[PDB]
């Protein structure tokens, strides 16, 4: 045509926020959820990583919206490796396909910045990239 | 030979103050949700019900301006019948290059910065 009109549009992928962490040298993809009141670890992962002895079965209850919601116990402290730093985290343990969900409690505790401009999570003294759609567990 | 009971501190959720068509709204900031949502009720009150696209959840609002501090930020909403009037999800946090800053307790979105609300102010 005699004239060419340019009408730009943005296309933005919106994958769920995940990061790579390590728990007792086991690589784990962790879900970053500011809408969660607690931080979760699956029974499968707690057992695999040798953290089951520290599942304190005095602390139960419900975490509605993940698995069956039935809490098995609390891991009061387990060191989580994020890049070059170990950081202490607490976990609500339940039967779920989500290995680790980092909730608002742990994000606040470690003064996190969830940076969607730069696509990274800054937590404690480290920075780690959000996973691409291809690396995200489904 | 056992008992169960509620213990004798809950983390407050992230909320911010926003205005839609001059109506003050307390918005839930949720990275666990892919999609930003607006209640049917708020769409009615703010005069956005006529902007709900119904082609296949009530529908989608494609562009509505959200006022944060002194600036307007265009957002899209999936309209549901819900108690939560606005839930800001990953789509709008990514679109507006946001930072959820828990060190300073603020949300940086588009070109503005706004404080998270106190526990007493949460809906």
Numbering used by the authors:
A (entry chain B): 188 to 325
B (entry chain A): 189 to 196, 199 to 246, 258 to 324
Article sentences:
Yeast Ddi1 has three structural domains. It has an N-terminal UBL domain that shares only 14% sequence identity with ubiquitin. Yeast Ddi1 also bears a C-terminal UBA domain that is found only in plants, fungi, and invertebrates, but not in vertebrate Ddi1 orthologs.
We obtained a new crystal structure of the RVP domain of Ddi1 (residues 185–325) at 1.8 Å resolution. The asymmetric unit consists of two chains, which form a dimer with non-crystallographic C2 symmetry. In the new structure, electron density is visible for the N-terminal segment spanning residues 185–199. Intriguingly, this N-terminal segment binds into the active site (Asp220) of an adjacent protease dimer in a different asymmetric unit. Nonetheless, while the observed arrangement is a likely an artefact of crystallization, the N-terminal segment acts as pseudo-substrate and reveals how Ddi1 might engage a substrate. The N-terminus adopts a β-strand conformation that interacts extensively with a loop formed by residues 245–258. There are multiple hydrogen bonds between the backbone atoms of the pseudo-substrate and the loop, suggesting that it might be involved in positioning the substrate for catalysis. The side chain of Phe246, which is conserved as an aromatic residue across Ddi1 orthologs, interacts with a methionine in the N-terminal fragment, suggesting this may be a specificity determinant for the protease activity of Ddi1. In Ddi1, the flap does not wrap around the pseudo-substrate, thus leaving it solvent-exposed. The structure also reveals how Ddi1 could cleave a peptide bond: the catalytic residue Asp220 holds an ordered water molecule in place, which may act as the nucleophile for peptide bond hydrolysis.
